[PDB]
């Protein structure tokens, strides 16, 4: 007996469960939102302990096949932490990996952005946004200097990028704090349960994208603070919004 | 208010 557990964000587990109805077993993948790049091997109670990148090559009556990729890489579930990102920093993600890629911004003066390697169609998730685990109150606390990379998670949670891990050379296991800003966006933050980084945000296109295409999303700052006004938000992105404002066709 | 939201 198979089961398939899908999340709202399109991914899901799969696998025969034991007699205790638990994803427990040597047999089980998560499938990402594609429907064909897996993570198959050794998962307890659904969580992955050893992930090898596969293929489902064809479902037979909800029965999957797959089929391992070459390569040694191996995955397993890896929360970060208020203070630990990653335990493999440069261990890249095999889905975004073949769907994004960083070089510098096409947006004057905004160091790297994050681009497409592929052409897709609307609603496809590209990237994945993990980072440390910290409070709002650390971060609302804090100089707009050290949240470059802040997004919130949920109601307890701030997902950031801090130095070093914002450089490529140190952390790449995920892309997401790359993309730029625009007030003009093509892709969206969204709710995403990964095998590897659990509950995160992911980057989501708003509509199909071509290869090469930079993408961008709205960071989404308060632009009317409740305690009197001028956005909270950096200088940079002060200054776009009144050339926003400006030059938008009504 | 000090980061991104989604
Ligand atoms: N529309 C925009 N214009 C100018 N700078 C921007 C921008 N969007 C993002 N940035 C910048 O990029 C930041 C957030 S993280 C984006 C990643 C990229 N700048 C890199 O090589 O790390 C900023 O703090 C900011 O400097």
Known sequence: GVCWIYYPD?????????????????????????????????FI????????????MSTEEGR????????????????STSSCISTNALLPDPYESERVYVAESLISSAGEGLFSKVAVGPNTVMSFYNGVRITHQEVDSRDWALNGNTLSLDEETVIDVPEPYNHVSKYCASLGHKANHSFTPNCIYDMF???????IKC???????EADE??????????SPPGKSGPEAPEWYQVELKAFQATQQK | ???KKG
């Open chain 1, 10 to 42: 399109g991914g899901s587990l799969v696998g025969e469960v034991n007699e205790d109805g638990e994803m427990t077993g040597e047999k089980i993948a998560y499938v990402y939102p594609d429907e064909r790049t897996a993570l198959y091997g050794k």
């Open chain 1, 203 to 209: 980057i989501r296109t708003l509509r199909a994208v």
């Open chain 1, 64 to 79: 999957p096949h797959f089929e391992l990729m070459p390569g040694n890489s191996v995955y397993h579930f890896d929360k």
């Open chain 2, 1 to 3: 208010l000090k980061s």
């Open chain 1, 45 to 56: 109670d659904g969580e992955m302990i050893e992930g090898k990148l596969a293929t489902l």
């Open chain 1, 214 to 223: 930079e993408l961008t999303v709205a960071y989404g700052y308060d632009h």
């Open chain 1, 193 to 199: 349960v990964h095998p590897r980084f659990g509950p």
